[PDB]
Design a protein around this ligand. Structure first.
Ligand SMILES: *[C@@H]1O[C@H](CO)[C@@H](O[C@@H]2O[C@H](CO)[C@@H](O[C@@H]3O[C@H](CO)[C@@H](O)[C@H](O)[C@@H]3O)[C@H](O)[C@H]2NC(C)=O)[C@H](O)[C@H]1NC(C)=O
Ligand SMILES: *[C@@H]1O[C@H](CO)[C@@H](O[C@@H]2O[C@H](CO)[C@@H](O)[C@H](O)[C@H]2NC(C)=O)[C@H](O)[C@H]1NC(C)=O
Lengths: 49, 66
């Protein structure tokens, strides 16, 4: 649900779209995420490991 | 997540791509004000060969009528 469940009713949203919105919040265009997704996922998995 | 019109992509400038049963629209995040997909609402960058979950659809043009 992203951050919506902290204000009103919980609203569903796919995870890659949520990450695109989060990138859009630090001054980076969203097309960066959708063009480099497998690499970002692998980096996240390695970081959490 | 995106729309591939002619070998390219079309990401929304501000808002999300939302479809009812048949047609497609672009709308705001926190309200429901559907609009027709035009070249003003979208910016093109890419090749629609790497985006996952893209749809074909079509995008209108305001310059051609005039
Ligand atoms: C999903 O949303 C779209 C956008 O509104 C719906 O398409 C629109 O549906 C209405 C209702 O059928 C159409 O209005 C009708 O127009 C005909 C003339 O073509 C008129 O004789 C009828 O009395 C009525 O006013 C409207 O034209 C149509 N939009 C377009 C661009 O054609 C669509 O119906 C929605 N999905 C579903 C499953 O309903
Ligand atoms: C979106 O358009 C592309 C471009 O035509 C379609 O890809 C072609 O689809 C035909 C029909 O199946 C194939 O014969 C071609 O080999 C495809 N070309 C490529 C480069 O993939 C695609 O199928 C369309 N998608 C939808 C959902 O309509």
């Amino acid at each position: 649900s992203g951050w919506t469940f902290g204000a009103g009713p919980a609203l569903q949203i796919p995870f890659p779209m949520q990450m695109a919105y989060r990138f859009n919040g630090i001054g980076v265009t969203q097309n960066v995420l959708y063009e480099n997704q497998k690499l970002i996922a692998n980096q996240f998995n390695s970081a959490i490991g | 997540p995106a729309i591939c019109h002619d070998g390219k992509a079309h990401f929304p400038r501000e808002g999300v791509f939302v479809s009812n049963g048949t047609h497609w629209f672009v709308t705001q995040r926190n309200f429901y004000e559907p609009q027709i997909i035009t070249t003003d609402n979208t910016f093109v960058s890419g090749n629609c060969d790497v985006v996952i979950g893209i749809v074909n659809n079509t995008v209108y043009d305001p310059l051609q009528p005039e």
